[PDB]
Design a protein around this ligand. Structure first.
Ligand SMILES: CCNc1cc2oc3c/c(=[NH+]\CC)c(C)cc-3c(-c3ccccc3C(=O)OCC)c2cc1C
Ligand SMILES: CCNc1cc2oc3c/c(=[NH+]\CC)c(C)cc-3c(-c3ccccc3C(=O)OCC)c2cc1C
Ligand SMILES: Nc1ncnc2c1ncn2[C@@H]1O[C@H](COP(=O)(O)OP(=O)(O)OP(=O)(O)O)[C@@H](O)[C@H]1O
Ligand SMILES: Nc1ncnc2c1ncn2[C@@H]1O[C@H](COP(=O)(O)OP(=O)(O)OP(=O)(O)O)[C@@H](O)[C@H]1O
Ligand SMILES: [Mg+2]
Ligand SMILES: [Mg+2]
Lengths: 572, 569
């Protein structure tokens, strides 16, 4: 509620920040003393240089030694940079850990491509403050406190004026700080929009070559930068405005000194007064960057309070395998326009069961919440007549492989694209078997040295036929007791399909499998078939039973068979 | 070659920097002069100010307004910073335009996730050079020359001590910049690496949920951060080193005062030489930062030197329409290894043709080739016995729709996902007409306000089945000369494809259509069925003729025939 307390609270979280900063400033503290004492002794010392020949060698040696300790100020600067280059490091560390552990429902709203720049750019702004200006603040406060002390006429007898410089200046600065804080909160919250705009586009250049997108996309980029970032000059305008105003209040000090004038002391008093300008320049800049840095962090703190969906809180049960049943459970991908309708069905183990649905139904999310991304609102999910949430929050997941409507990959090689599931016992001799069981070997060995082979960003180097096949190798290698194929027909030929169907049947006899297929033909043989329509289910039983006994559609399957019926008369 | 001329050349291509910068420096010039003359007047003004306040007030108020005019130097800093804010915006502008128009080939060998950061974090460093220290480089250079010229006996009779202060310091700085320059190319090429890692991790979070990746992939971020950027402190090490080294060179001049000046005012000499300290330090920092900026921009320049392939240099607009022909085509995705073998086929116009093949064949590469993304090394691609290359590079694309094997979508409103075909005259009246021929509105109008609804990053908000249709609308809206359905059955049901196929038949009757579809049942009735395999073509003609006449498979169709025949029994 103060725009200040959370900041110093957040930097405190990086524990090693206490190690050297106080030591760093203290080294700079003595640097201030020698600087504030050198000019008052050189005039006396040069008077002692009336001969400057025999003693000059010793003082020259002394000056040699002393000016090395003048160079010692850099060691404070190096340390000050060092501790700063740590407080940024842990800040990235602590954020990045928190940026994955939070529920996927958060990412379905906040445009992940935008929030990436809140790791790089929304911390680099702190760097300029933490290193240089802080030294200015320390070197200034000691200088100003070391200024009025010699003003003994001014700090014990003529004090009515030293106390008027700060309240006026700060009163002037407060609007400036508030304005600039309203700037930094934007310049960061548009960098994220800008850097986000690219990764939503640039990795997809294949489409943006639509023969006119390049014109339009170039338009969006420019309107992103020029109309916003160059208009960030608004920060520059207020940043330069401080000079006059910080000189203005100081001017008022001077009208006060001439209005309360005795004669033999004021002459030196004016000279002493003309020393505090440079400290005032540094101190005013510190607060300017201070409330600047906050706006570069105001967005960051909020993503440090989202509720960490994953826990290790698996109470006492992880392993005993029992069927999975959903009891009157309904879910909303949006908290009001619920898209599902109190599904109730049972998944008997040891027997594969298939969901088939027309495009627009509730197939995908029924997987996406059966892996407990969402914890649906109405109803619940059980296995073994026990609540699933009592098993774990995501330690349950490792017993379950998964592929998506798509087949995503990551920029590593084809090796560490399959490994990180078990991530301890890769068992190089077994990566082969999983690729075999996904029919991946026989069209990989021809590639240049599988381990050496490299995908593009989204797996452009591999292809659609190869992309889907390599994805399920992740699921079959993880050795699960619960499996989800998601598109056995996405991008792969019938040649691939028969081998895959002939392969995973050999493993998954006592390990329950739930698969959804684009075409009804691939999973007719399964021991149970659901038929999801717009969040409801209006069919059960085996497909052969479903045809004759049940008659809601009676033609969804027949909408497939008349497609293939042309293949008999025209062929023989 | 010299690694400094291109920088002033790279800045040069952004024109407007030269406009107001001279006025900015000129203000800094008079800023230096007034700072040069301020101490001389005050030490004698106080003698005049020694008079009572009756005369002091009349002069003090004039000194006050002088101070406000001394405050005018602030608006000089704004001028530099604005000029700086102009040059950084220009660098982003030029870089962004060159980034789009390069051949797609570069965006595969390189990584898009890497190059994104080179527009945000690889120009911001140039700000800190161009804002403050550029003034220091000017303030120092005038002050040092002015201060040296004050030594009017030392510059014409005892010049030995002025030829050592600067050149010896420069000799010391030579390794410092060289070490610093090597740092910037490393730190910037790793910030690029770090930002590259994240944009290919977060968007696919649903698969980093492998129940152990949250521990492992988090480690990759740390190992990227901690072992590199907390070790990026290594430049802060040498950046401190300027202090001690500028010390020895100048004290070496301090001992030179007795090395040659001990035989000859002298006290005024010592006073003045203790004033060149801050200017020399200020100007020294500028060179150090310069070698820092040059490194963070030496990788920057290189991607301004690619072929910027797309042009309008094709002196044709494609008014006519003739069939597509492939003449002895052989393409390789790498100049050494090739996946296409002398393929020869004629795409008959105005009547649908198809390509069917197995996984990992040459199907979709032949699409990217026929869109002329790559211009194959061997053979040629022509239409009507005229090469495609003479026509244009990407005005031809405007006549050909293209839906990909995956279902791509930019982020925005699903309206805006289809709008930019004509990019000017969206003509709201018949967007639904494109959707109806794509079977979309029956599963769109029920949603909240077709325009209002917005997809996520890769269409996460809509479904995969929905996305593949919503992409195919972009194909039909362009009303193209050539239609390219790449995945007609990827993610969509039987209730879709029947309504889909029945729609395109009316639309394209004299407009040729190239389609590749799995599950051969869906392309049985096309005029020409082509078989591709490992970069070679081994089939022609109608499906019924190719069935028994050719003898390669005789069972590839039977592949699904026996797979689908089980439903009846
Ligand atoms: C309180 C009112 N008194 C003054 C306030 C001043 O404010 C200044 C603010 C500045 N901006 C800071 C961001 C800079 C750069 C120089 C300033 C000077 C200045 C300007 C030109 C030449 C020399 C000096 C100077 O400081 O030397 C005086 C001997 C300055 C001088 C006086 C007397
Ligand atoms: C060549 C060796 N001789 C010197 C080198 C120096 O290097 C300095 C480098 C600096 N870094 C630049 C980025 C800064 C900030 C101050 C420096 C001072 C300095 C430090 C504290 C107080 C006053 C001064 C100072 O300069 O005033 C001397 C009267 C300094 C002084 C001397 C004598
Ligand atoms: N943000 C959202 N996330 C998931 N589903 C959504 C969202 N918004 C709406 N939906 C609805 O939820 C359904 C989820 O799609 P689903 O996972 O079933 O796709 P699918 O399994 O590939 O099948 P389809 O062929 O219908 O795409 C869609 O039909 C869609 O209408
Ligand atoms: N970036 C790439 N571009 C082209 N080919 C690649 C690339 N990376 C790898 N390849 C290799 O080139 C071959 C051709 O793949 P292609 O993209 O033609 O498959 P496809 O036509 O998508 O197959 P399917 O249609 O069955 O998915 C692949 O077997 C693959 O091994
Ligand atoms: Mg799904
Ligand atoms: Mg393909």
């Amino acid at each position: 509620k103060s725009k200040l307390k959370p900041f110093f609270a957040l930097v405190r979280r990086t524990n090693p920040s206490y190690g050297k900063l106080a030591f760093a400033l203290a080294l700079s503290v003595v640097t201030t003393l020698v600087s504030l004492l050198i000019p008052l002794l050189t005039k006396q010392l040069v008077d002692g240089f009336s001969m400057s020949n025999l003693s000059g060698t010793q003082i020259g040696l002394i000056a040699l030694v002393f000016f090395v300790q003048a160079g010692l100020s850099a060691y404070a600067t190096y340390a000050l940079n060092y501790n700063g280059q740590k407080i940024i490091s842990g800040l990235r560390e602590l954020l990045w850990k928190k940026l994955i552990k939070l529920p996927v429902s958060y990412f379905d709203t906040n445009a992940s491509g935008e929030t990436v720049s809140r790791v790089t750019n929304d911390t680099m702004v702190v760097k300029e403050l933490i290193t240089t200006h802080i030294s200015g603040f320390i070197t200034g406060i000691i200088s100003v406190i070391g200024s009025l002390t010699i003003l003994f006429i001014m700090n014990w007898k003529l004090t009515l004026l030293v106390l008027v410089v700060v309240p006026l200046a700060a009163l002037i600065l407060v609007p400036i700080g508030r304005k600039m804080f309203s700037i930094s909160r934007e310049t960061q919250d548009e960098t994220a929009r800008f850097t986000g705009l690219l990764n939503q586009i640039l990795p997809e250049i294949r489409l943006v070559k639509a023969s006119n997108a390049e014109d339009v996309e170039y338009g969006r980029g420019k309107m992103g930068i020029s109309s916003l970032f160059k208009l960030g000059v608004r920060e520059a305008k207020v940043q330069s405005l401080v000079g006059p105003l910080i000189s203005l209040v100081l001017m008022a000090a001077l009208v006060a000194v001439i209005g309360y004038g005795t004669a033999g002391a004021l002459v030196a008093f004016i000279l002493y007064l003309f020393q505090i300008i440079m400290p005032m320049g540094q101190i005013t800049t510190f607060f300017t960057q201070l409330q600047k840095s906050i706006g570069a962090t105001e967005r960051m703190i909020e993503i440090l309070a989202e509720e960490e969906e994953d826990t290790v809180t698996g109470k006492q049960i992880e392993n005993a395998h029992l069927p999975i049943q959903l009891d009157r459970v309904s879910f909303g991908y949006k908290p009001d326009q619920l898209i599902l309708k109190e599904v109730s069905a049972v998944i008997e183990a040891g027997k594969v069961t298939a969901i088939v649905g027309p495009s627009g139904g509730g197939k995908t999310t029924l997987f996406k919440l059966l892996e407990r991304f969402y914890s649906p609102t109405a109803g619940t999910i059980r296995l073994g007549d026990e609540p699933v949430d009592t098993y774990s929050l995501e330690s349950w997941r490792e017993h379950i492989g998964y592929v998506s409507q798509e087949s995503p990959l990551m920029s590593g090689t084809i090796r560490e694209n399959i490994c990180y599931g078990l991530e301890r016992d890769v068992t190089d001799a077994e990566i082969e078997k999983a690729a075999e069981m996904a029919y991946a070997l026989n069209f990989i060995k021809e590639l240049p040295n599988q381990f050496d082979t490299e995908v593009g960003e989204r797996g452009i180097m591999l292809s659609g036929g190869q992309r889907q096949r390599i994805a399920i190798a992740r699921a079959l290698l993880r050795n699960p007791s619960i499996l989800m194929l998601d598109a056995a027909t996405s991008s792969l030929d019938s040649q691939s399909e028969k081998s895959v169907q002939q392969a995973l049947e050999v493993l998954m006899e006592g390990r329950t499998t739930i698969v959804i297929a684009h075409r009804l033909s691939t999973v007719v043989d399964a021991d149970q078939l659901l038929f999801v329509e717009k969040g409801e289910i209006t069919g059960r039983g085996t497909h052969h039973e479903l045809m004759a006994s049940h008659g809601l559609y009676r033609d969804f399957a027949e909408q497939q068979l008349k497609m293939n019926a042309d293949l008999e008369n025209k062929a023989g």
